[PDB]
Amino acid sequence: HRYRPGTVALREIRRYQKSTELLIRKLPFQRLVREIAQDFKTDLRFQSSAVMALQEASEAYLVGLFEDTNLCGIHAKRVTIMPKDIQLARRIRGERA
Amino acid sequence: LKNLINSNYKDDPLKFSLGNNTPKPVQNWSSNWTKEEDEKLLIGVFKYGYGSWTQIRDDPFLGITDKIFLKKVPGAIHLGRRVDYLLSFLRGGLN
Amino acid sequence: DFHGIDIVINHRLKTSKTVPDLNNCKENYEFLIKWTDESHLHNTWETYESIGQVRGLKRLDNYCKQFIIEDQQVRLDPYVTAEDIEIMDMERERRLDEFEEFHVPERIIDSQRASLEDGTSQLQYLVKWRRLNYDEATWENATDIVKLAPEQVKHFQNRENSKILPQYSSNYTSQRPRFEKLSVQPPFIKGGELRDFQLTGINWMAFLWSKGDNGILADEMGLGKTVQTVAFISWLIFARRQNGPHIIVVPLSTMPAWLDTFEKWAPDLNCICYMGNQKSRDTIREYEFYTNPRAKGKKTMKFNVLLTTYEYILKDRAELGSIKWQFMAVDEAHRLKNAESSLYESLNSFKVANRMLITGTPLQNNIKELAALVNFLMPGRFNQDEEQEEYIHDLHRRIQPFILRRLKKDVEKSLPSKTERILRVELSDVQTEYYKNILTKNYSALTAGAKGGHFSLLNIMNELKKASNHPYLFDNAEERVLQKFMTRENVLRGLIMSSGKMVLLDQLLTRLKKDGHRVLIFSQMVRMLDILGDYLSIKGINFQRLDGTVPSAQRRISIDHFNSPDSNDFVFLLSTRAGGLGINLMTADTVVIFDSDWNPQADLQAMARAHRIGQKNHVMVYRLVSKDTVEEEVLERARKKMILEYDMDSIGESEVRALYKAILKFGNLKEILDELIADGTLPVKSFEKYGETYDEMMEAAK
Amino acid sequence: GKGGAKRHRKVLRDNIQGITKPAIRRLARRGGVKRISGLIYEETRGVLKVFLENVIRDAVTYTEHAKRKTVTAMDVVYALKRQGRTLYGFGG
């Protein structure tokens, strides 16, 4: 496999693409919601899927984010996603001010 | 051979001894050969049977392990030649 | 593959101030080093200028770091007490105890003749060592193998020579041999004699063994149930000549027992288990086959019996599924409770002929399991006030066969008596606050209001029950009853005080304390057990905990430490499922219950671990029944739950080619007939047919 | 400096400490950037939090306009629909 410099960097990427499993765990996420959902109302219940569905939404939501972030990052002469790279992306999409 | 060691050396096979009786010297064989080595060689078949010699050479109890070479002597036939000669010899078969 | 550092064993001084520096260890300390990829036995007292840069530097440095500070906390400080000196030294003592047992070898796996650099070939044995799994078995040459463990090597040869593989088993598939009632104890029980309720049990298992039907062993919790199977395995092997690789699945908690229970009650059939991970996975297969790979199903066969944890079933369902099995053992088979289980149809794929469950599972709680058990042993086979007689006319007549019901009225005559006392504890001060306020969101939402939401139902019928007697199971409880703002007396007093149960337990414990009884605490909840872990140490009573979180090796060490003749700790705390998991306690007399285990009978076994055949100190049981709470009601349902409790033609030329060579090799071979047949040399023919041919063959010769 | 009947219970399923950091990087590479800043990934969860609330806000509302205790997954869908992130696959 050639040498070692930036060897995995592109490798993991590819394997992750071929797959289609959830990027983030499905146990911490499950409480995260239960916990905030309480603050806006009491005595809450949850459909098995409802979360499954959120996970799907969210994950997908972030990737998408990163996907631009990357571009921005490239624009900059950089291969590094940065704390702001996040902001511009959002700002111009418009949720971020 | 099964009969004599059974009735004199039963509880411990290896103590088996030649005593005076003299079986041929094997001067030019590659490794140290002396009456004690024959003493074990016989017990070895008494234990494993004629013709399986790796069994005999490896045994931890015999202590024959780097005196067998199955240009280096004696090999498999050399022993085969060795036993037939000793067994007949002490019963008085060559009469 | 290189000669690099593997671990640390022992540390000692090398040479004749306030803190030793690393230099001091280098110029004043010698350390015993175990080398990488090599058994324990070759350990060297080596320093750093002695070896220089060697691959692996990390463990010694830290261990020295541990050593430097250790030195400052035994001799070099006046805040140290009497007891820390005891532990800091003690570690040295135990660290070596877990190191000593590796030197003693426990099984020799195989034997390979490999060549050396002087042109020589020497025999090496794959040696397995004590209380360790199949990994890191390195080759050692035979010169000293018998020079330290002669007995292992003697036995090593014996199994290889004892030709009794699954290769010669009798064809009784079509139909069976008429079987016989045994009076006497079989000349295959070296462990001792059993009694008058362990040989008949055996005679039923083997008695319906010949019917083609499987059965349920439903006796009391510990009536030599294990001996009845092992003996059942033993007599089905030297009776009907069954070498058929018997598969047995037991609990990870209860197997070590079984092994010894298998290796001391029946020497001659070897018992190789399945308890590894990745590496093991290979070693099992090394001995599980002969001659590497094999066309068809032509494995020569090198085991009969195995022990499998429940994990491992499901992790490798497939390989067992393919190999044939005709006899099944399982331990504490109340697992198959629902007919939707994963092991419930996992077991059905394993081509099988007869099964054997053995547990005391009560079979009236739900009719599901009663049916599930019947459906599982026999796939296919299956109220009204006035039809009930009609109903048990059908149920009693059918259920019995594949069932056993037998009371203690046995071996209990010697054993000292059994007893249990209830406890009515009424509520406390801070207690009502959280018995009253919690059933609303008044002051449950003021303090910890964010969490209120998720625990709100938890607290109602599956907490109040559990958090009725003791409110200390959340956050805003600890300082609630302590009325001040470090104190040591007060914390101890403040914690004992809040609960009705804590005081009641503290005094009874004290009460027997001076009389001399060993006391047991079975708690439902993990944490309660730390809670006490914190209090009893403080007041100086020697103990160990028994949770759901412990390595097999660590679990095993203490269980024995406890039942030894002269053990100080009369206090031992255990779990409901983790406690009653398996095992036995024979020294213990008293067992106390904090709360009923949300159900009838989880307690009945919970006391079963302590109340066994051995115990010579009667027995004592206390149940802390809470008053004016929710504990009461389940206790009543629990009651509702347990209301019901019910010739080969002739010898061809090739054999004649086989027989002639064997005579030149062994001489008269009439005595050795079976040993050769078991292995390649001879076909299965009757003993005489060969013997006569042997004689005429010389008769032709002379 | 005492044992003091000490009991330790802290919260790491739901709360953001508990969740797994690789769980994110897992996410980061699908996009395929080479490098992750420490600062950055902390912000990212930050936003996740912002996105997550608004949805549930609505979810909760639809559960409640119908006087229902069990929250429907459809309920989430419409929510997503309102922000223009509607999910095919679900709940026609």
Ligand SMILES: Nc1ncnc2c1ncn2[C@@H]1O[C@H](COP(=O)(O)OP(=O)(O)O)[C@@H](O)[C@H]1O
């Ligand atoms: N039938 C028996 N005959 C002789 N000894 C027995 C018998 N049953 C049990 N024992 C002895 O009692 C101990 C535990 O047996 P048992 O009580 O059946 O196991 P368990 O804890 O599974 O019930 C063993 O150490 C064994 O020596």
Ligand code: BEF
């Ligand atoms: F019959 Be037991 F608890 F191994």
